[model samples]
Every structure is written in structure tokens, then in C-alpha cells.
Target: QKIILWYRNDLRLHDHEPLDLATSTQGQIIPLYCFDPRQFAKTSFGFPKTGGFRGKFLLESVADLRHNFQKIGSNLLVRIGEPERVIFDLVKQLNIDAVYYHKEVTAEELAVETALEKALTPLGVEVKSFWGATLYHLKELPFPIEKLPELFTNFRKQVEQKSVIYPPYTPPNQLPQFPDIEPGEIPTLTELGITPAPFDERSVLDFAGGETAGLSRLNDYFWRRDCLKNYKQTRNGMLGSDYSSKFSPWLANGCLSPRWIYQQVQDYQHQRVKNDSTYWLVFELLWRDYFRFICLKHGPKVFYKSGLQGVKIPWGENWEQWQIWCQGLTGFPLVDANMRELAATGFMSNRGRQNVASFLTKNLGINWQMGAEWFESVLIDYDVCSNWGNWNYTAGVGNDGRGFRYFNIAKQSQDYDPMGDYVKHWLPELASIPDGRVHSPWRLSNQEQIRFGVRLGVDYPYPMVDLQESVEANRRIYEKALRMT
Candidate 1:
């Protein structure tokens, strides 16, 4: 007997059910990963769907997976092109009897699985998939996925009351010998049709990919540095890496498991002090699970223009407007700082993400999908469910029942980043400005601008649109639509 263990987003071996099932077969096991060409291609927005930043991260992750397999006396088979075509060819070549993989909840991934199963069915190869992405197993959920609550708070309350989390599994010491075959090379950034991204010296911490690095991060954040104790306070910070768990990149690539992180958090609570911060870390894990389950319940509607709610919004589109925002020339310091950080580093703080999303959708009246697409192309930690779900929430078109929630950009700047150190750090042109004037350089008088050695329109762009007028216009649109709905 022989089996194929297909690695998809769930890249790591630890706490992975698919790997365990493959090993349980006690047969020749073939570990496989397919670098689908479409994933690296350009999007409708004219940007590479998987840009160099994530492309390089993925390349590093696959290499680390291969290295781990070698440590356990096994090898991972890498291939380029679509998984359906690649896996079918492998079945024919290796005469494999069964295929196993982790199930993805999104429509795009589901489509691939359907195609692969169709290809394998005629050949009499059995295909099996397990749900292993969330902190809690599907079987342990209080309700079936179809009945998941529409509101996140409702979903959280129900799960906290009734659900139980399963512990993560340990990786096997060794694996069944690999069948004689060529171990294909992991593709390079250039080979993947992307220009290699330059190093970002200003990045909070250099994020490395793979299970080894993921485990090291887990040990350091939860135990060594004891950063989890202050996660609630620091998670919103934009300046440095220590603010949040910084686990999303690894989790997004499947280099780390939510269950593994959850278990470690549990251990930390038991050994250290059980506080709100410790509990809040798990609260975040539940949020990760909620997004996945939301995708499972709604299917393709999650990606629709109106989102899961089906509320028709008169979304605006302006290429010039979007261009200014994309380039960090929006003239709004906080928004520009966050956008510039994402453009340069492929990462941003949670506070930054919410503020920017609200600015694009509510303040500018731009289509939410456009911002989501841009984030998809850029964020190293982009998870389809979380990214779209959040955009939908902030845009007031998704599960958020609130009537037109909008962020006051200047107020948010004053509240979250009062010192304006984050904005100054990203926008060096305003580096000399004092703290009070840094958030809104456009508000400075001509003399103040001159004294600060900065010119609003010359050195940095002035505010592209009137923030109050835009907010009021967008509010009217949302209010009118709300009445109709």
C-alpha cells in the first residue's frame, strides 16, 4: 500500500492530522507540495497575487518543511503547476492508492479540491481531507457549521460556553520510507515570476518561515519574553514587533497550527498567572476560528461585492484616489504611515489594518473589495477568510450589524498614536515636526511648516480629500442604504 500526503496551507508537521493519518497507513508515504502557477500570477488589480514578499516567505517555508522531513529520514516531493494536474500525474507515476490533505474552507481552495478529486476518482485513488486549521476541531463545535451564529460576539459566547479545544498532536519520530523518486526543487522568486523584494531594514523583526522558526517564536513570546502577559495592551502598537503575538504569518502559511498555539497559551496560563491578557490571547485564537467557520457557513458569499449580508452598497471607484492611498500619499499621516508600512514590509499592526480599511471604505467611499485585493497581494499574513471578513465588517457590508461604523481618522491618530512616533518613523519628511503637529501636518501654519523644515504640498502631499466632507458623504450613502434594507 502507498499514500500521498499533500501539503497545502497547513505546511507544518506538528499537530497535523493529515500527516498522522498518512503515517497510520504504515505504507510508503509520499509528501508532496505543488506550486500552482496561478497563485503567483497577476490579479485584476494589476499586481502579482503572490508578490515577492510572501513568495520568498513561502519558498523559505517549503524549504524548511523539506529539511524537517529529512531530519525524520523522509523527503518531500515538490512540483510546479496546478495540484490537480500535478497530483494526478504523481498518482499515475507512483501508482499511489490513497491521497490525504487538510481541507480548506474557502471557495477557491474548495474548487481545487473538487478538481483534484474528480481527477483521482476515475483512477480509483481514494482522497481524504481533515479540518485542522482552527483551534477547536469541527466535531467539538457546539453547533454544526451550518448553524454558526451570524454575529462574532454571539458565536464567541456560544463557543466559550459549550465548546472544548482539542490538544495538538506530536510529530512522528520517523516516517515511512519515501518511494524512489526525484525530489523537485522549491521555486525561486524569479522562477515564480516575481521580482525579488529588497530587505526591509525598518521591519520590526525579520520574520523567518518554517516549523523550526515558528516553534522558536512560540517559545520566546509565550515563555522567554513573557510578552503574552501584555498582549492586550501591546497588540495595538504599530512601532515594533513585541506588541502582538506575531504568529499570523506562520499560521497563515500553515507553518504553525492554531491548536499548537492554543495549547501553549493554556500551558502558560497554568504555569504563570491566569490574567485577562492570557485569556485575551485565546480570545484572538477564537476570532481566527470564527473567521474560518464564517467562511464555511457562507461559502462564496463571503467574497461577494455586498458580502454575506447581501446589502447593496453604492461603492465608489477612483483610480487616482486609490493610487494616492496605495502610494502613502493620502496626506493623512496615520493612514499613509500604515499604507507605507504595508507597501514596504508586507506587515501592519491590527490597529493599522482597521484604521486603513475604514478610511478606504467609509471615508473615501472606495469599494471594500479593492482594499481587500490590495491586502491580498501584499500582506505576508493574509488569510482569505480573515482579510475579507474584516474588510466586510469595517465596510459595514458583512456580519457587522452596526449601522455604518466609521473611524475618525484624526481622532484615531490622536488616541492610538498621540506621540506620532509611528507616523514620523514611516514618513521621514516629517521627522523634524514636533509631536503635536506630526499627526496632521496639513493643519500646521505656513510658518510652522517652514520652522519644521517641511512644506505640505512640496515635501509631502496635502490632504487629498476633505476628511469631514468625505465622511459625511459616505455616511449619507450608508444611511440611505440602511433605510432601504
Candidate 2:
């Protein structure tokens, strides 16, 4: 029997159910990776769907998986076509017995799965897909997805009490057999119509995509530096590498498994010490899992304008404000700094993301979908469940039980960057400004602005909107949306 282990996001060997299952069946494995052109096309309002930073990361991930397969005495067959077409042709050519993959949750991916399923049924070929994205497997949940709690804390409490995370399984040492076929070349960035972006020296991590890099990062953060001990305290810091676990990129692309990370945390607890910090890491993972589950429960509604809550606010259409926000020129240093960091580095701290997202949706009153789509295009660690769901939640449109919540950017900036290092690190133009003044340079007097050598409109533009006024106006809009019945 022949099997096509069609690898998508889950690119690694460890804790990979489809790969493990395919190997154990004693069938010839043709592990395949496809470079779908649709994924690379300009997806939203003319933004490149896969930007250079993440595009480079993805190519490395695929190449790394191909290299890994070779280590186990097998090769990953690569293709540049639709999955359904590629798999159908392969099945017909090789008389493939089965097609196995770790299933994806989004509508786009689900469509591909359905197309492949439809193509396979007539040929008497078996196609089996396993749910491998989340920490706790989907079926383990006590409640059906439709009944899954609207609030994350409620979901967290119920799942933590009722469901158990399955332990990670070992991958096969070697393949049983393989077809004699030439493994296709992995495309370069240029081939994929992307101009590769170089790594920023100030970046938190020099991210390389693969299990090797992912696991090494695990060791570096938890063991080498011993930063996991204080993760909860330092997780919000915007500057430097170890402020957080930084496991997001790997987890987003499935190079690292959440269950595997959970296993490591428990091991750290046993070997080192179990405290709130160690516990907080898993707490964050629980949040990540909740978003994925929410997407599964809500479907494309997670990407909706009114979003999961069905609120229809009269969102802003200030193109000038929107453009400024995109280029990190909103005159709000905190939001600007994070946006600059993201455009240059394709990564932003968890704290930074919340502030910038809030500034977009809440303060500017811009459509949250624009922010979400931009993030989907640019963020290296962007996952559909997390990015869209987060934008929805931040915009007061998704599963926020409170119905209305937003970050007070002024207070958040002052609190997080009291010393102003994080702001200065990303926005060097505001570097000379002293202390908290950097947080809002527009507040400085005309004389003080000249003294600081940063003019209000000349250097950094004036504040986008009066924070107090915007908050009141934004809150009014949120209420209007919620009251529409």
C-alpha cells in the first residue's frame, strides 16, 4: 500500500499524528509539501498575502522538513500546485492507498480538504485526517464546539478541570519503503515572487524555521538563560529576547507542537521549580488554544466585520489616519514604535500588539479587518485563529464577555515604557526626548520641541487624535453597535 503524508503547517516529526500513523501502517510514505500560488498572491486590499519575512521562514520550514525526512531514510516530495490536484495526480499515478494529514481549521484550508476528499472517493482511495493543531485534541473537549464557552476564562476553567492533554508521541526512526521519484526543488523567495527581508539587528530573535531551531529556542529560553522562572513578570517587556517564551512562530507554523511544549514545561517543573511563572507559560498556551477553538466554533464569522458578537459599529474610513497608522507615523510613539518594529522585523511583543491593535480599532475607530488583514500579510508568527480572533477580540467584536474592552494607550505606554527604552529602540527619532515625554512628544511645548530637536509636525507628526476625546467617541460608537439589537 502507498500513502501520501500531505504535510501542511505541521512540518515536524515529533508529536506528528499523521506522519506517525502513516509510518506505523507499513505502507510506502510519500510525504508531500505544496507551494500553493493562492497563498502567495496579493490577498487583502493589494497586500502580499505572504510577506517576505514569513515567506522566507516558510521556505526554510519546508526545506528543513525535507531535510528531516532524508535523515529518516525517506524524502519529502515537493510540488507547486493545488493540494487537491497534486494529491489526485499522485494517487492515480502511484495507485496510492491513503492520503493522511493533520487537519487545518480555517475555511480556505477546509475547502482544500473537501476538494481532495471529493476527488479521492471515486478512486476508492482512503483519506484520513487527524486533528493536531491544538494542545488538547479537539475530541477531548467535554463540550461540543457549538456549546464551547463564549468567555475564555470559562473555557479555560472547564477544560483545565475536565480535559487532559495527550502526551507527545515518538516519530518513526526510518521509513519502510519509498517510490523512486525525483523530489522537487524547494522554491527560493524570488521564485515565490517575494523580495526577502533581512533580519533586523534589534529583533528579539533571529528566527529560523524548523524543529531544530524551535527546540533549541526552547532550551535557550527555559534552560540556558533560565528565563522561564520570571516569565510572568517579564512577559510584557518590549525590548530584548527573553521577555516572553517567543515560541509563537514555531507554534504558529506547527514546527513545534503545543503538547510538546506543555510536556517540556511539566519537565521544567519537575527538574527546576514549579511556580506562577512556569504556570503562566501554559496559561498563555491555553489562551492560544481558546482562539483556535473559537475559530472552529465560529467558522468564517471569526473574520467577520461585526465579528462573533455581531456588533455593527460605524467604523472609521479616514484613509490618511489609516495610512499613517500602517507606516508607524500615528504620532503616538507607543503605537508607532510597535508598528515600525512589525514592518521592519515582522514581529512585535505581545504587549505591543495589544496597544497597536487597540489604537487602530478603538482609538482611530478604523475597521478592525484592515488591521487583521495587514497582520495576516506581514506577521511572521501569524496564525489564522490567533490573528483574526485577536483583532476581533481587541475591536470589541468577538468573544469578549465584557462586551467592551480596550487598552488605554497613554497609560499602557507610560507603564510599560516608563524608562522609554522600548520606544527609543524602535523609534530613534524620538530618542533625544527625555523620559515619559517620548511617549507623547506632541505634548511638548513649541520651545521644548525645539530643545528636544524634534519638531511636532516636522519630525514626528502631531498626535492622531485627542486620547480623551477619542475614548469617549469610541465608547459611544461601541455602545451604538451593541444596542442595535
Candidate 3:
């Protein structure tokens, strides 16, 4: 009756339904992980799908999972290759009776699961899947996932009124014993085809991966430092680690479960004062769930350039425009700072993401899919649904019903980074410039530049495109696109 418990995105021991089911069988259990080759291969956009930051983070997480299992007198088997081949070989060798894993809805992940099931079927082994990713289980939803509303507000209202947040599953005191076998070593970054990524000193926190670190972070944010008290007001801030939960990387990797996080928040509310800030964290979690459901409902349409509506917007193919945006030389200080931060740290704030997405899709008139793929390559917290869902929303091609949604670059800079502190921290060349002038460095006079010891088009780049003119022209283009719909 020995069975395999396959670890995919749901990496942690806590709140894992498959792990519980595996242990409940009272038979031998083999915990396995596969470093799939396709994930490490180069993307369509000519960058590794799992870039160095995420690659390094994933290795750390796997190591931590193995360590935790060892404490409970068990070990995790690691393999590097395709899951279908790796698991099929293991089933034959281990004499496994069944396979248990969390089900994933994305096309590639679903394909892998289907293939694995087919491979194991002839062996007379059963494949079972459980819901493990979101705040609400699929079966528990008030309506079927296929019937989910396209509008977020409608979906939110319906769920807030009818849905329930279930309690997280607890792990067994001990795992089922299995026969001896060779537990392969975790692969190194270079072996995984990921280049060395040096730590960025400018990054807000030392982001190590795994469930232990994620739990410690949860404890600190909710109880130790009590930063959750001010989360609503400061979550949008760009400069500091305390500004938000900083939990996305863990949540994205499934080292932290949304249900477990929900429980902690509830505990905090019971022990301390429950305010909008406390509730806002859950609100954000719902947003995360909304994207997942949206992806589930729409399938591969979320990945298309035309998105859900399938409207033909005049998206241009300009490598120069994209390069400038990627290099943080767009001449818009706020957008540049956010882009520079992402390039260096593989992280960005919510406020920063919106502005940059709007700048690229609306202002620069470039294809949003390119930007989405670029983020997929670099961001440590990249989740398939949220990343593409957001890009689609901002590109006027997805669920955000507002077709002509735009951001005034200068106005956003003035509002969010009025003191230019965020800009100065990321773009050091503009560090010496004083208050209001820092947001628009190209506007400084020659004497001011000399005083500041910075040169436009030398130490700093000149504005790539005229901001006001581009905004007007872009508005007209977007308006026309919407009218066609």
C-alpha cells in the first residue's frame, strides 16, 4: 500500500490536503519532488523561465522542506527531469500503489498532471488530487468555478456574503515509514542553468525561501512588531519593507498557505483590535483568489495578446521602446525607479506595478504580453494567474471593465513619491537633487545640473518620449480601440 506524495507548488507541510490524505492511508509514503526541465528552459521572450532569483529561492525552499521532514524522522526524494518520466520510474522501483498531489489549473501544469495519470494508469496506480492553493477550496465555493463572474466586485460581493473560510489542515505527528532508497541531492543553481544572482543591498528585506521563514515572518508581522496595524495605510508605500506584508514570495511559492495566513489573521483579530487594516489583508487575499478563479474560468485566453475580450488593439512592436523601459531609462523618474528596483531585486510594490504597466501598455503603446513575460522571468513573487491577470487588466484586454484606464506619470510621481525618496534610493545619480525637481530630472537647468553634479544624457538619460504628447496620443488610440468594441 505504499504511495507517493508529489510536491509541486504546494511545498509546505502545513495546510496540505494531499499530505494529510497520504498519511491517513496508514501505508508507506514516499515524498517526492521533481525539478522539471521545461521550467528551467528559456522562455519565448529569450530569458530563462525561472530566472536566478526564483531559481535560488526555489532551491532554498526545497532544502528547507527536506530539513523539516528530517526533524520528523523522514526524508524527501529529489529528482531533476520531467515528472512523467521521473515518477513513472519511481513507481516501478518503489512499488507505489497511488499518487497524491495538489491539482493545478494552469494549462501546462494541468497537462503534466494528465500525462502523469496516463503514465501511472497501466501500472494500476491511482492518481488523486486535492485543492491546496487558494483561500477558498473549489468545492466549497457557492457556485461552480466555470460560472464565476468576470467582474471582481460582483464576485467579491457574492463570496463575501455567501462563502466560508475553512480551517487549515494539520500535519500528522509522524509520517508512514517507507523502504530505503537513494534520496537524490537538491540541484545547484548552475546545474539548474541559473546564473549567479548577487544579493542587492538596496532590497528591503533578506528574502530567504521556505515554510519556516514564512511562518516566522507571519509571526513578526502580526504579533512581534505589530506592523499589521498600519498595513492598510502603508501597503501602497514603495520605500520600506514594513510598508506591506512582504508575504507574496512565500505565498507565490506555496511555502505559505492562504488558509493558514487567514487563520493567523483571525487569531490576531480575536486577541487585538480588529480594524480596516486587519481586514484589508484578507481583502487582498480575496483579490488573489479572484485572479485564480478568473484564470480557471477563462483558460488559455488569459495568456493571449487580445485577452478575454479578444479585441484587436493597435499594439506596436517596438524593441527600442521596450528596451528603454526595461533598462529603466524611460526618462520618467518614477517608472524608472520601479523598473530599476525590479531588475535589481526581483520585487516591486503594488503601486509601482500599476504605474509601469499603464506606462508600457497605454503610454508607450507596446504589447502588454511582452511586459508580462518580462515580469515572469524576473519577479521572485511571480504567480501565473496574478501576473498575467494584472497585465491583461491594465492592457484593457481583461476583466477591468474600464477600457481606457490610464495613469498620469508625473501626477503619480508627485502623489506617491512626492519627496522623491523612492527615486533617490533606486537611481543614485539623482540622489543629490533637491525636493520637487528630482521627479523630473531632465527639467533641471544647466546651472542646477552643475550644482547637483549630474549630467542629463550623460549621468542620467533625457526623457525618451514627450510625456504630455504621448499621453494625449495614447488616450486617442485607446479611445478608438474601445469604440470599436
Candidate 4:
């Protein structure tokens, strides 16, 4: 019997449930990846499901993944088209008795699974799906699916206290393969129906995807730079690569495994150091897992306009207001800089994400869902659970068990990026605006504006909405969240 292992987000062999299951089961295995057309197509919101940066990153990951498989004497087959049709065609041709895959819970992935199940039933091939997306396996859950904890901390404490299994199995070697398939071209951005993207040297996060690249990054960040030792301090930085572990892109794509990261951290602790900074990286990993668990608990409720708490608000729909904000013309340097960086690089810092998202939804009274969906389209590290889950928390429409937290934009600018280097890099029109004035350029006097040639309405946008007015706006908006259960 021939078994086909369909690789989706779980692209790596290490700690990959589907691949391990395929190799252990009694048959030859065919590793397959089908590039679904919908991923690159325009959404109803007028943006592609994936933008150029993500497209480029994905292309690179697949190319390297193919190479890694080839080194172990196996081939990764790439086909372009609908996944259901491709899988159906393969089953017909290969006499496959079983199909194994990693389970993905998000709506887009669920649709693919439904399609596969419907198509494969008549073909007499049993499809097996295993959960490889989390550090903790489903079997180890403290509560069953129905009783899963809604809040992140609750789930984390329960698991940390009670669960025995912390790390999942990482495959020791490339499994023996005895199958032949044609190696297809790893398509470029242009081939994938995306316009070619220009190289931007100003990009903050230079993220690459794929398993081999992911492992190499783990080695360099945890061992070489010894950056894990300072992760707590640097993870909030908006400037360069060293600030954070930069593991999300790989984790998002399943090019890297949480278990692998967990194991490496253990090794680093034994070899080099075991400080709070080192422990904080693990803390963040647990945070990532918490978001996933929150998703699992809430299910479809996490994506609702009301979110899991069933919080309701008017949730405005002013297109012009949103347009000005989206273009980075908000005249709020902190928010605009973050938006510009995302537009240019398809990535944003964690702090930047929370600040801008809060500004849009809570502060400006715009719809949180709109901004979340926009982030979903643009961000390279856009994992459905984290992106929406975070937006919901920031907007105060979902779970924020610690009450609502809001960032004072100007104050945040003063605190984190007081030197104004980060703002200057992205919003260069304010290049001459001195450090003190750059964060709130609108506060500058006419003489200062004229001296700097930073006319508020011309060279730079005037403040789209007053900070005081926005604060009042959020007061009424969040008042509605109070009524939510």
C-alpha cells in the first residue's frame, strides 16, 4: 500500500506528526505540497490573501524544503492548482491506501480538509490527521475539548502544573523513502500571480522561511549571538533582527516546531546560561501556545465581530478615515511609522502591532475586524490565531482578562524610541524634525515646521484626528465592552 503525506503548514520533517506517521505506517510515502491558487488571489476586501513579502518568503521556504528532502534521498513534489483536485488526482494514480496530514484548525484550512474528506471517501483511501501545531498534544490537555480554558493564563497554569509531556517528538533522521516523483519548479512571486516586489533595505525584519533555514536561525540566535540571554530586553525593539528570536515566521509556516525550539532552549540552558532572558523566550513560546489554546477553546467565536465575549459596538465604517490610516498618513508618528514599516516590509514589531491596532479600533473607533483582516492580508507572520486573537484583545472586544490596556501613543514614542531613530527610518519626511519633536510633529510651532520644511499638510500629513478627541472616542467605545459577558 502506498501512503501519501500531504504537507501543509507543517513543512519540516523534525517533530512533524504527519511525516512520522507516514514513515511508520506500512507503505511507501509520497511527500506532497500543493500550492493552492486561492492563497494568491484577491480577497473580497481588494487585497490578495497573501502579499508580495509573504509570497517571496513562501517561495524561498519551499525551494529550501525541497532541497532538504533531496539531501535525504526523497523528493518534495510541488503542484500548482486546487489542493482537492491535486490530491484526488494523485490518489487515483498512486493506488494510495492512506493519506496522512497535520490538522489545521483555522477556517481556510478547515475548508481544505472538508474538501479532501469529501473527495477521498469514494477513492477508498483513509485520511489521518494529527495535531502537530502546538507544544502540548491534544491527549495531554487538562480538560477535554468542551471544557478547555478560555483565558490564556488559566490554560497555561493548568498545563504547566498538571501535564507531564512538555516536548513533542523530534524526528532523529530523515526517514527512509522509496518513492519517485518529478521535482517541480518552486515558483517565484510572478509565477504565483503576485507582482514582483522591490528590495527594500529599510525593512526591519528580514525573515526567511523553510525548516533548514529555521534550524540554522535557532542555532545562531540561541548559541552564537547569545541573544536569547537578552530576549526580554530586545524583543520589544523595532529596529533590527537581534531584538527578538524572530521565530514566528517559521512557527507560522510550520517550517519550525515548538518542540524543537523547546529542546534547543534546554540545551542552551545546560551549555551556556540559564537566566530570565533565556527563560523569557520560553515564556513567549508559552504565550504563542496560549493563543492557540484560546483559539481551540473559542473556536469560531474568536473570529466573530463580537469576539468570544460577545462584545458589541457600533464599529464604524468610515472608508476615508480608514484609508488615511492605512496609507500611513495619520500624522501620528508612532502609529504612522509602524504602519509604514509594515507596508514596506510586511512585518511589524509586537509592541508596534498592539499600539497601532489599539489606535485603530479603541482609540479611533474604527472596526477592529477590518484592521485585523488587513493585517491578515499583509503580515508575513500572520498566523490566524495570533493575529485575530491579539487584535481582539487589543480592541477590548475579546479576552483581555487583565482588564483593558491602552497605549498612550505619544508617551510610548517617548519611552521606547526616544532617540527617534526608528521613526526617522520609516517616516523620513520628518528627517530634520529633532528628536523631541519627531514623535509628535504636529506639536511643533510654525517656525519649527518651516525650519524643518515639514509642513504638516504638505510634506507630512496633518494629524488625522486629535489625540484628545480619540481618547474620548475610545471612552464611549470601550463603555460598550463593559456590557459584554
| Pairs that collide, model 2 | none
Provide the overall lDDT of each model, using Cα atoms, as 2-decimal numbers: 0.88, 0.89, 0.88, 0.81
What local lDDT score does residue 160 receive in model 1, on the 0 to 100 scale? 83
Q: How does each model score on TM-score? A: 0.98, 0.98, 0.98, 0.96
Candidate scoring better on TM-score of 1 and 4: 1
lDDT by residue (108-172, candidate 4, tens digit) is: 78889999999999988899999888877878888887777767778778988988545656563
Flag regions of model 1 displaced more than 4 Å.
none
**Tens-digit lDDT track of model 3 for 248-367:** 989998999999999999998899879999999999999899999888989999888889778678888799889999989988889999999998988999999999999998779899
Kindly list the per-residue Cα lDDT of model 2 for residues 1-485, writing each as its tens digit. Answer: 78899988898999998888887888788999999888999865678999988998898899888888889899889999999998899899888999999888889999999999999999999999999988888999999999999998899999999999999988788996557887899999999998789878988888899888898999999999999989999999999888998999899898999999999999999999899999999999998999999999889898778788887778887778889999998888999999999999899999999999989987899999888889988999989999988888899888587767889988998889998898899888889899777887877898888888888889888887888798789998888878884
How many Å off is the CA of 401 in candidate 1?
A: 2.1
Q: What does the lDDT come to for candidate 3?
A: 0.88
Model 1 worst lDDT run, 10 consecutive residues:
397-406
Give the CA lDDT, 0 to 100, for residue 26 in model 3: 83
Model 3 ranges off by over 4 Å: none
What lDDT score is found at residue 412 in candidate 4? 86
Q: Taking the tens digit of each residue's C-alpha lDDT, what string does model 1 give over 1-485? A: 79899998988989988888778778888899999988987767787898767887888899999999988989999999899999999999999999999999887799899999999999999999998989887888889888988888998898888988888988998997777788998988888888777878888768888888989988988899989988888888888778998898899989999888888888888998789899898888888888888889898898888788887888988999988889889899999999999988889999999999999987889998889999999998889989988888888878666877888898899888888899999999998999857987888899989999999999999998888999999999988887787
Q: Under the 3 Å rule for N, CA and C atoms, how many clashes does model 1 have? A: 0
